[PDB]
Amino acid sequence: SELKMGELSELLGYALKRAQLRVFEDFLHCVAPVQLTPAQFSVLLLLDANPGRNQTEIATTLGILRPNFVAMLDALEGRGLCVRTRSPSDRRSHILMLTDKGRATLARAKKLVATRHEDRLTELLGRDNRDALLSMLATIAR
């Protein structure tokens, strides 16, 4: 009455998706007090590390295509978490910077991520094992 998972247990791609989907699902739950998807979260994180960059640069480093990034920024900018300002140098581009509200929302989101989510992962595995997992996934992506 339970099905045999056959050779699927040994396909690494398969393990990654179902591993990715629960981690993302858990991310949405833990972080729901600030209402940020993982994509929105990373956009705030990248904006925080690299102030002064433009849409093309932020979107590419994240793997987001620029036609799909426009709608994401409208959400965050509509919620008053970041600003598009025209660069005086080259008025084709929008330089992107965080608001104070954005910096606060990034701050508390960072806590719910570390305390409720990322730390709950680190204890279910080795603190060293989780770093090895993170290293390998980083290697796989290159």
Added chain:
Amino acid sequence: SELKMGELSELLGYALKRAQLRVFEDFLHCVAPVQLTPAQFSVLLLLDANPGRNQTEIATTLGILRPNFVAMLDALEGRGLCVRTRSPSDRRSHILMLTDKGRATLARAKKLVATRHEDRLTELLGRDNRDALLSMLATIAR
């Protein structure tokens, strides 16, 4: 002039998703001679391990919603790789088994993924490091 990846380097969710997409992309390419998506591959693999089952049982085990599974089978049956047969006891259920064609297409894809894909990725990590990766990703999914 290159972007600071900030705390994203330590977001496990992000590393999990971007690791998955290179693997899924690499999978698609290696298996392109047979025309099978990774999902279709697993549907054929699980049918091979679990003959005599119905749609609801196959679909639910894979995370496919049953309304989404219909067209997915339409494809594989249209390709003559598996067939729907009504069980005489309960004619609401469709019993699914792979055809001779289905198994031939499966044997082959299994060889294409094993040689070009799964073997190539085991080699970019330690053969022992990769089994620890598959162990941990399996752990995360429960």
Added chain:
DNA sequence: TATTGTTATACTCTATAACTATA
């Protein structure tokens, strides 16, 4: 001419409600 932001569009995936034919 090339690039930035943008619109429009399309194709996949995923999600939900409701039908049909059985039971």
Added chain:
DNA sequence: TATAGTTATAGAGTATAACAATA
């Protein structure tokens, strides 16, 4: 009523072409 398979639909996510403003 309840369940299996199906249909239609709606929403994400992602992909490309093209156009206006600007370089």
